[model samples]
Structures are given as C-alpha cells and as structure tokens.
Target: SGFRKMAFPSGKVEGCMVQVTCGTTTLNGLWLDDVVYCPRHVICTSEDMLNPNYEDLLIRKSNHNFLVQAGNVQLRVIGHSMQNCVLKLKVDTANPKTPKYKFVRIQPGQTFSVLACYNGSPSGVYQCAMRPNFTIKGSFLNGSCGSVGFNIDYDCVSFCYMHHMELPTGVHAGTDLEGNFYGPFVDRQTAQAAGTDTTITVNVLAWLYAAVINGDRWFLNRFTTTLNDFNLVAMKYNYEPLTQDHVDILGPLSAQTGIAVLDMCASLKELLQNGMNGRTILGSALLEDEFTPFDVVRQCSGV
Candidate 1:
C-alpha cells in the first residue's frame, strides 16, 4: 500500500505551478484564474464520476406537469420538450414555523428554462437571490436535428464557499493559449466562442447550485477535486497567482450560472400545466454521490 504513496525530496518540486497541459503541451499567460485544475492523481477511481447523474427531476405527462420533491424544495415541471422549459419557484423558508416552501415553476414548451435556485429561502442561512438559467435550442426536423442553443448568460463571481463579496463588475484581464479568455465576457459565452467549448459552464454551475442547496458536502465534493487539481497540479507553489485566477474566472463562471437560472423558468412553465398546485410543483429529489473527504477539507483550510 505504501507503494501508492511516494515522498519527494523536500525541494524536488512535488507540484508544479498550476499550469494547463493538453497532451504534452503546457499552457501559459491566459490569466490562469479561468482554468479549473485537475486532480494530481487519477481520482476517477469509481465509474460514478465518469457517469454523472443528470436525472429528470420533473417531466410533463400529457397536459399536466409533475411535481418532483427534493428536500424542502419543489420543482414544477412544464413543457413537452425538455429543451425549452422553465422552472420557477419562490423561497419562503424564513418562517420555520410556517416552513416556507421554494417551488420550481416553469413555462411549458419554450426555448429557455430554469434549472434551480441557489438561494431559495428568505430566512435561512442560505438564500438564492436569483435562479440559474439554462438554454436548450435545437430542432427536430424529419428525424434530423441541427441548431445552436445557449442559456441566459451571466457570471461566476466568487466561490460558493466565499459568497461574502459583492458581485464582480466589468471584465478583468485574462488570457489563454488562444489569447481570448476575456473575449466572450463569460465562461459559457467563451465556450460558445471557442467552438471547442463543451458544457463546462453548465456542469460546474449545476454542481455548485446543487451543493449550495443540498449542503456544503455537494459544494466541497466538486470544489475539492477542482481546487485541489488547480492548486497542487496546475498552479504549484503559487497561491497568489492562483487566487487571482479564481477571482477572474469567478466572473465568467457566475455569468454562466446566471444563464443556468433561466432554466428554472422551465419549472415555472410546469406550474401552468399542473393547475397551480403549489404542493405538487415544489418537490423533487437531488442526487449527490461524490463526497468530500475530511483530509481534503483540512488541507483546503491551509490553502
């Protein structure tokens, strides 16, 4: 078992500065803040991480929307097509006695949708001022589909762990190997611009929203892996530089998160179908598998 661990000489550069490496090439100069880090060791030990869970919280059955319950929150489903839907709900969790319920309501059959709300409760320690937006635009014509889709875009201002700061304003200086980090004004926008971009924005924001809603465990699970990878492997020995990257990237990431809030609009549409049943629209299950290890939290504190 010891063979799995190796001790490097005290100054042997156990970790390199957090740098981007695609194949054999190392990336530099593109304000490192935007780039997320990967784990030092192959952490994909379980197939679970590879097979992420993107389950349907709500679905439209006939003309009526279904209410999927997840903890104290509820998601109202709307729309025949999953692509253009909305999830809308109000947070009333302030009066514990009254037990304010956050409902996910959406408009049925549209091009936009709301995935979830970050702060759903007004009185709780955690409150989502706005919902995450999502956009799914594509067409199914004659059994063939070709279209471009995007969520309502916004920014990633700060770590969900560090939500104390005011939302960032204006774009900052950022660069990448392609030298266009700040070009699109947001991560999702950048992804759309890059052409090579995937749903990295959606995935990251979704994970963040879920964690924030479910608990710190969800946040830490994803944060642990990404932060550790960035610090240990991507930006070795340079905490200040890495911090700047986090700040810069936060704006774009936050912007993407905003777009995700629109997806919640899909749930709002669902409310219309369900005959305005408050209880039915405000319940759904959230799945969180990967967990954060205690050691990771301890290490993060020192970071």
Candidate 2:
C-alpha cells in the first residue's frame, strides 16, 4: 500500500496504442490496435487449450465431423491422428449456414474451430476473408497436456495488424530480448503457413496468449501454487505488459485485465451470441474486483 497506488489512472487512453513490453521498461515497436487485437474469451472452449477454468461453458463434446457445431470464423482446425493429436483447416469462401444446419435452423454468432484433443506440432496460422480477412481465422494447439496448448480466436485480426508486406514490399519487422518475434509478411501465403516454421511463429504470438494461461494460473494458483504461470505476490491487470514489476498502477492492471478478458474468452463467445465484445464483459469483472479494495476476488486478485 505504500506507493503501489501512486499513479492513479488518468483514464488517458491513446485511442489504440497498447504497449507491448519487449523488455523491462522499454516498449516494443508494434502496439496492439485495441480494435484489431483478438481477445481469448471470444474464441476458446473448456476443451480449448487456453481456457483454464472450465466449470461453466465447457468444451462441447463433439460427436462427429461437421464439427458438431464447429467452424470458427477465425481459427479453423480439424484433424485427428487418433494420434500429435495434430489438427488442420483451410480458409474458404463463406457458406450460407452449413451442410445440415440449413435443413434446420436455430441461431448463430461468431466464427471460431475444429480439433483433436491429443497432441500437436507444426505451427499454423490461418486468417483470410472471413477466411475473409479479419473476420475468422484459425488456432494451432487443439488441446492441452503439460507445457503446450492452443486455441481458436474468433475476433477478426485486421490486415494492418497482420503486417506491412505489400505485393513485394513489407513492414519493417522487429524483435525483443524477451524472445519475442515479429513477422513482416502482409499477404495470404504466410497467413496460413503451417509445419516446422510454426515454432518461430509461436514466439511471436506467445506474449498475448501467455496472458490467458497467466490468468489460468492466477485462478488455479488458488487450488495449488505449482505452475509456471502461477504467481504468489505478482498482481496486475491483463491490459499492461507482462513484465514482473512492483506495481504498474492501472497500467499493470490494464495488461492483466486484457488477459483476464482473454481468459474469459468462452464467456466472450456466450456474450457474442448475446451481442457484445465480451472483452469488456470479462474486463469489467476484474475492474469490479480491483475497485472493491481491502478485500479481493482471487479470480481477479490473483491472490
């Protein structure tokens, strides 16, 4: 309490300049456009490798192909080794509903997954026109086992967010000591690149995805404090950088809140069906906890 509350949030939002800490205090060249950044909640399921707490809207047990209600607009994957539990998917033109759904109708919302709940390798990223640029994409990891996991994000990633690569020209990409990697391609070829090259891709996307599991540990730490992502003293929101610091005021909370929002990803989907961004739906929860003070909600407090 000494000086932790020093910097009161000025509420000075710079439209969409979300700081990505490549290092301790330094900022990464690339900033997240709040509009372009995809929150996890809008995409994951309990079976979702990223979703840690699966008490509520757990992964729907698929009975057969056709996804049993799958076909995420963003992360499209469908493979079964029976076996890395490896998965696969491809971007395609929009279909007016589905094979069977057209026969009967119920409702609809976000674009989001196909999968194999086992093992995975071969890094892959898919984002096309809805398969259509910034509409629906794809997920890499189908499930979780120990250290690895993957998810299908539904929020559309803007073309600008993808890269600077023109037909021949490209954005000046950069990197960080944190092992963070940024790509320069802004075309369709690399958009769905899969296979070994995926490992490098993983490093690039890890910073944010790490937050979902980070929140996972924040919540799971309550049950047991034996996780890499789990923390005992660390406290902050999912909107700020993931650097370990004394206190970032709301800057820190902002970082964690964004992630927490990502963590609530599934609920984001639920809300998506209901009509909302869901990041705020989830972020609002952490905000409520932070303002409560004196007492804290472990879900939001990471206590």
Candidate 3:
C-alpha cells in the first residue's frame, strides 16, 4: 500500500486498509478509514468475539508497560483476484503509510484485519486519532476522519492498477482491416493515441446506457437523438448493417437473432420519434430525484 494505496472512505488520501469486518449496519464494519500516524508504544488489545471493537483506549498500553493483556477482536478486508487488486494496512506499531510498519500476508479472496476500538462514536481507523486532520467526508460509506470499522471486492481500480481490462468500448469505433474493433477506449483520441500505451480504459458513455435503460429519464427527451447518433456512428463504420440481402450472398444468421440486435434500437427510435408527429401530445414529467427545472421524461403523449 505504499504509493499506490486506495482512497480512504473519509474521501482523503487514496488511503489504506479495507475493513470487511463483522459489525452492525450503522457501523457496517465495511469501509476505508483514513491513515494517520501512530507510535510503537501506542498499542492496545481487545477480546470477546461478539465484541468488534479493536482499538479501545481503555486497553491502551503505556511505553513502560508493554506486557501482554487481553484477547483481540478482528475483521476481514478481502481482496479479489477475479478482476481487481485490493490492499490492507497491517496491524503494526508504526504509521500505515510507511513500509516499515508491517506487511500483511493475505492475498486474493483472503484479507487482513486491524485492532478495533468501539468508543460509541466509532472514531479512528484503529483509534479516533488515526485521522487527526480528517474531515467528515463520510456520506458514501458513512465514514470520516478518525472513524472506525470497512471491503475488498471493490468494483474497479485506478489507472489499471489492481484491475482487469479486456472488454471493448463496443461502439462508435471501427474494426480493423481484419478483426472487429474491440478495445477499451473512451474517445477516438484514447482509442488511437493510447494504442502505444500499456492499458486501455472505458468511456463515460459506456456507463450511462445501463442507468438510462434501468429507468432514469433524460433531461430533454434525448432518447431519439441518442439512438440516432448511435445509428449514425454504426453507419460511419458499417455496423451489423448486413440485411437479408446478405443472406443470399454472405449467408444467413439465425432467425432467432433478436433482430440481430438492431431491431430495438431502430424501433425505439421510431416510437419516440412519432411523438413529434403531432399524432398525440407530449409533455414533460417532473421528478424529485431530478434537478430544479425537473427531469424531462415524456408525459406519455400528453399524460
């Protein structure tokens, strides 16, 4: 976790440690905590399996009294090998940001756990002092500076680190002189320019379709324009533009081929396009989850 550490749930310092611990829904025992400084003598201990608190000050050990004390409670922070890499800051005596602290031995599908201190407010990664200069940037994971208790199945990694990328951008870009166009590229710039680079990336557009299809309305009835643009691009590079005419020459695909994938795109395009024909009236629907001017869902032809 040296220079490539993950971001803390406090929204600070691509920080350290993913705590997939056992705890409550409120405490959750799942999030990234801020990494702060700690000293050798500043150690503590805890036990009680049902008790998930690992860094309680009541069990604090002094510099002179370094004797063994109580048992310990632990939580797991798992890293997956199926797609991405994850990291864990070990339960060492030094600062987690340094290599001198301790190196965890866990690998993919396995994880690490640190000492816990459940002081009711859930302060610190190991203690409330871990994120001394931390902020309350805990909306997403309900985490913050000096907050306690966290995951390892992270969906993605940064700049190809701890990540797996073999999928294509799948649209707009063209196939080569031989094989089809398949690569992870956001824009034409990255597609062509990044060919010389080691890693490829997905575009923002690649992520928007699923959400849109799932039910989020566009801001301005852009469904038609989106499909139109998609069709235009498919034309720019010859999509599955093959028709039944090709069946006579290039051979036939299965009749079960879901309109060969283009049927819905075209039909949905025409369906929404008819709204502008004046056949039925069309209005906009306001959404609470939408913005000030409101969302732009078609009012079902004047619903």
Candidate 4:
C-alpha cells in the first residue's frame, strides 16, 4: 500500500494556524511556519500591513502601501489602502506652465490604478508626485507623497555638425602690445585704429568671415574697400567677387582654420611680394591660381 498525504491550500484553513492530518498522524502549526508557502497563500487579517495585527506586519511596517511603475513615456499610479480616497498624480509638479495631473476615485477595501502619460515630445526631464485627496475641509493629515523622475536624452545625428567648429590656434586673435587682444575684427576701422605696432594678436580675417556668416552688414561694411580691392585682383584671373555667396562658401573653412578669407588674401599678397624681393609689383603674374581666395573657397566648398 502507498502512503497518503494531505495539503491545505491557504484559505482552506481558518485562524492563524494550519492543520494537516494523514491516517494516524496529525500536524498543527501557524500558516506562516510553512517554509514552502507562497506569500500569496497567506491570509489577510488586518486593514493594512502597517497595523500591528497584520499577518505580515514585520515586513509591512517598513514599507508604504503604494506602488509606482515608470516606462518610456508613461507611469502607473497604484493605491493599496483599505479606505476609500481620491488619488491625484501630477507630472512636472514644479513647472507651473506645464503641470499635468491624473485623478482617480478609489472605493474602500478595493484596489485601484491609473496611468499618467506624457504627451510632450521627449528629450527632457520629468518629475511626478502622487498623493491622496482629502474630502474634509482644512484637515491636514500627514501622509507620504510618492515621487519619481526620469530624463529623455537627445538622440539625433548632426545636431551642430561643422557649425560650431573652433578656429585654429595660430589663426585666432593675439594680445596687443598694450595688453589688449584684437583681431577677428568685424570692423576693420577698429582694427586699424588700434594703432601701428598694436600687434595683430587677433585674427582679423576670422572676425570678417564670422561677420559674413552672421550677416552683420554693419561690421561687414568696414571691410568693403578691402574686399573690393581683393576682388579686383581676383577678377584678373576670371574669378567671382567676394560676395555673400562666396563668404558663405568660405565660412566653414575659415571656421575650421581659424583664418579669415581677408587674412588669406593678405597672406597671399605677402607671399607674392616677398617672392618679388619685397617690391610692390601690379599684375606680376607671380601669384598662383591655387593660392587665390576664389580657388581656396572653391576647394573648401568641395565644388
């Protein structure tokens, strides 16, 4: 003959104790004394786990009767109280302009849940708080307010590609003899007025290029003569004028090299004159087409 066994599936028993019997053998013990019992198999004997008489009072005393779950763009609000109450959940509670709320009325001795969904586009920080709504007027009862926060990061390619490139080290402005830094000048007059031997610490041409890129007509006007003079020389080689379109093409390269198109012209002139034994020769045919501003812009633009 085979031996017989008896099992009590939680609710099948009454009181805090459980009993099991098999033929001539009988066993009696507390329901929680069973090591193999699942927590769900325990009986509810108190209003809440916080109460002293609660079945799992030891564990419940340290925990609150609420639950929160967050997802990509949404969060869940759950209530685990034994009394009826109105729950209010707020998103971005600190932001008065875009505060969001979700409310739910829960019945006594029942479970209730609600979801708070964020409708705004992602890539930002969000904070949410939840609390119970009291019906009585002016009664300030102490309670816990559940709070959670999350951040959505930017996920795009080329946000500022080539737009924020820094100018090269040597091509930037330098400190003048008067301990003043100048160059990258939008106003050539400002640069010239700084006086001779003022030191060309700052890259005046870089500023000119920036002026063009930013469409600063007031500053660009200061370099009208310089740009015109350079354009006249460039025209001898059948090249276009140093207009806004040309500036646009040259902007990124100037940004990359920290050298302005104006400065590049000055350097070319210097190289040509130096090769001519420092002589001011017009149309000397000594300047190479590759070294021209127009050629430089075209090469940089990949055109």
Candidate 5:
C-alpha cells in the first residue's frame, strides 16, 4: 500500500509530471505538503448556498434546479395546478435581436421534460421561462425563468491540476533527492533554455525506477505480466530477468549514464539491466502504449 505513484499534468504544457515514492514507512508517512505546491485542498461550496434563478444560474451540477448533461441542458417542469390546464413554456437565448425560441406545452399536475442543446451566440446565455398570463387554477407555477451558461474547458484534467497544485507563478524546476530535475515551466523557450522540462522527465523516471525496486504493488500488478513477456526475448539474447538489486544498480548508474547508455538501454537503464532484448520493449510497453507515464500520472492525480 505504501506510496505507489502520482501524476498530474502541468496545465501550461501538454506533458505531465509524476512522483513515485518508495519504502513502506517513508512512503506511508509522506504528506501532500511534501510535494504539492499548496498545502491545502479547497472545494468551492459557496455555489451550493446560492438559489439558482434567472439572475443567477447554476452552470455545473450542484444544489441547482437545472442539470447539464453531455453539452445539453435537461429542463424539467413540475405542475402545481388543481385542475388540468394548458401551459405554454418558452425557452430563449440571451440575444435581443434574432432571439431563438423553443415553445412547449405542458398539462397541469403532470411533469414535462425538454432537452435543449446550447445554440446561443458566443458569450451569450440561455433562459427558460413560462409565458405570462397563464392561469393554472391553483398555486403559482414554479421552476421557471431559470438561466444556464456554457463554458468550454479544452483541458479539464490539466486545468484542475494547475488549479489544485497551486504551482509557482513563474516557470521553475527543482531537483529530487536523487539530483534529478523536474519543472513547472510554461513556454518552450524556458524549457529549452533551462532544460527544465527534459530534466523533469528524467527525475520522474528515476522515481519510477525506485518505486519498482521498493515493491510498489500497484505498479507491479499492472506491469509485471507484460514485463515477463519480454523476459523470453531477453533470455534468448543472454539477458536475464530484472530483480530488485538490478533496479538498485540502474538507479545510481542513471545519474552518471550518458546518451550512449540511454540509447542501448532504450531510454531507461533499469530496462537495459533487466535484459531488454531491443528498443521494442520500451516502445511497445510505454511510448506506443496508451497508458504511458503521462496517462498514468493524470489518472493517479485525479485531475
């Protein structure tokens, strides 16, 4: 159970960052403040208190009257009339000229539903109302004249990571215990000049190597079978199955390993020492695989 690994995308960039902590006691004792830029997790609850109406509309699902599902709004009407009466409902966007309207008729003491896909002018809002002068022969009809707004998030996962991580304002990179670098940089200019991004990737893999040696059950369970498949090829080429000691040796060697070693090792020294027969081991297992390091990191971070 100890610390397995955690990943989060740096919203400013396309790639992600990962942290893998090892050791039963050391990992279990670790705290968010140790790695996270922010020491606190804050959830926005103020919206829950707001009564969503025409003036104030609830955008996301919460304590609201409307529901947004798959880029569409689900409108529900609850009748409050003593006798059956025809009621006209109008749904319109917030545009004055060329306003689009959708009309629906509802009967008393019955619930009605309307599905509206957002088609309002860019930056405009949508509103649903019951046309005035309609007497239902009972209490006033409620759940009307409510508005809903749409905002697109191109990178929902990355946005959330950047928000919750509270990364430093400017671009920067830091070294881990193994002296490997990782960054919180923004632009390619900074990344190229400082090599922060590249260094971060190196540091992440270093941590990953350590995690594997420390018996990270979660990672082993997922990768062990696939790695075992490669063992057959490794044996044919005089390569042996990788062990904890092999990972330990590879971890330190990486600090001093050069491009040639990396080239032969297929980018990871641990893989090389573990008797990787060819580059296909890494390509097939990681880079070409959908569940790459970034993918795993993104899922673990819950962003």
Candidate 6:
C-alpha cells in the first residue's frame, strides 16, 4: 500500500506519486517496507544479523542426478503454491559482506523446491531469492531450516471452515406417572410399536441437562465474570446427570431469547417468589374444602 506524503499534494501519478516512486516495479513491492540491502563484500545471501531459527527448507523438486549419485551435499527446497509462480536461486561470490547465494523472484502464496551442490558447514548462511519478486534469507545451521537444506521449501497449508447444524431430537420430562423420575430409560417398546411419541422422555432429559451444564461451564470460563457463572453450576452439581446434547440446546435458546442464563434464572426466581411466601387462593368451586375462617397468610421472611 502506498502512503501519502506531505510534499506531494496531487495524489495520482504514473511514474511518481506523493513525491515517491510510483511505477509498478518489482522493487517497489519488494522494498515497500524499506528492507535493509545486503552488505557489499558479503560472500552470499542476506547480510542481516541472525536470531532464533524459525524457517525450514522445503524441497521443491527431486534431483534425479543427486538421487542416482547419492550426493551428500545435494540441495533441496520445497514450495507450497509454486504452480502459478516462478522460482529462482543464485549464489553470490562477489558480495563478501552479504555472504552467499540468495533465492529470488519466488511468487507469493507459492512454494519452491530446489536441489544443488552445497558443501558448506551446517552453520553456513545461504540466501535464496524468488527472482523478479521476493527474497528468502535463511541459514544452514542445525535445526535452522525446514526439511530442505540450502533450497527453499514451502507448505501449502490451506484454511478451511467447518459447518455445524443441529439435529432434531426428542425432549424429556423428569417424572413418571407416580412422580418418580426413573431417568435415561428409553421407551424402546413404544418407539418400535407406535413411533408417535411427541414428548421428550426421561432418557433425553438426562442427556440434555448434561449438555446444558457443560455449555455453561465453557461460557463461564471464557468470560470469568460472576454474573452468570453459578447459574449453570446449579444444574451441573444437581442430583442428576445431564448429556452433552442437553448443554448444547441452551446455547441456541440463550442466543434466541437475548437473555443471559443468569438473567433467566433470576426470572424463574421471581416467578416462584409467590410460592415461597405461601400465597394461595381457593376458588369458589373448592369452597367445600376451604375453611370458613380463612387461614392467616404469613410471608416467609428469609430467602
């Protein structure tokens, strides 16, 4: 990207713009970041100082001759996406300050592999340039480069997206006819005999609850706030076991309801407040069961 300078008021120019060179030259792109030039008298590649070795030499093409002769000093380099870009390598003997040969004009988003005779020590510094474009500076020290030795190696690792779609499943109730929850017992007889059950069985609830608790834990770990943290903890340590799918459902529900899980718990607390205070009203149909004097209503003071 080109930046605007103070000297050049007019923005557009073919040869020069913003008081800087503006031709679509290869140097413009390569040196756009003001890279340091290799020092003169360097026998080879880049003249910059060294640090921790991070790059690896990836082999591009196999040298039939090297393979046939079994040369110990054969060069090897690999490229990731070299199909669309050209790869070039050179050895610089005149530049002692720079050191050795450099690869040149290697295309972006591509890998190049090269094999040649390089008998230097493991600590020798070599420069590889992708001609007419980019330059790769690396060293031949142990563990300094990738699998490739003196040549460049590229890995065409591509990024991908994963899709997740919810599967429609049954829901479960906590109790049976006798108000006893015999959990996780799928009604195989019914499912096989009629297949018309619309309600979620106890078996499903167990799984769903498990999922809900796990999701709550994950969300809490990410946020680390006390607000909704314990809401799911209640479900997690409750006197029941929940499933992975159980927790996943809460994720969609919370997103759809636009309310945090903690807020939902708060709402439930409010709805049950009246029951806590023993608030009850008998209808006229229950007059026979109602006491004539009417029971005195006392609110529970403690929560």
Task: Give the TM-scores of the predictions, in the order they appear.
Answer: 0.18, 0.16, 0.20, 0.19, 0.17, 0.15
**lDDT-best of 3 and 6:** 3
Error in Å for residue 293 of model 6: 45
**Candidate 5 Cα deviation (angstroms), residue 232:** 28
Give the candidate order by descending lDDT. Answer: 4, 5, 3, 1, 2, 6
Per-residue lDDT of 200-243 in model 2, one digit per residue for the tens? 11111222233332442222111222212322111111221223
Per residue, candidate 4 scores C-alpha lDDT tens digits across 241-299 of 45665555556667665556676655543432344453321223233221223223322
Query: Which runs in model 4 stand beyond 4 Å of their true positions?
Result: 1-225, 236-240, 276-303
Off by over 4 Å in 3: 1-87, 91-141, 144-230, 233-258, 271-303
- Better candidate number, 1 or 5, judged by TM-score: 1
On lDDT, the candidate that comes out on top is: 4
**Superior by lDDT: candidate 1 or candidate 3:** 3
lDDT of 3 by residue, 104-133 (tens): 222111111122222212333310111111
Q: Give each model's whole-structure lDDT.
A: 0.22, 0.21, 0.22, 0.25, 0.23, 0.20
- Counting clashing residue pairs in each candidate, in order, gives 76, 41, 18, 8, 2, 61
Residue 197 displacement in candidate 4 (angstroms): 40
Between prediction 1 and prediction 6, the one with superior lDDT is: 1
TM-score of predicted structure 5: 0.17
lDDT per residue as tens, model 5, 157-232 = 2111111111233322221212122233221112222321111223234434333333432222212233444445
**Per-candidate RMSD vs. true structure?**
26.4, 23.0, 19.2, 31.2, 24.8, 28.6
| Model 5 weakest lDDT span, ten residues long | 24-33
Clashes of 2: 41
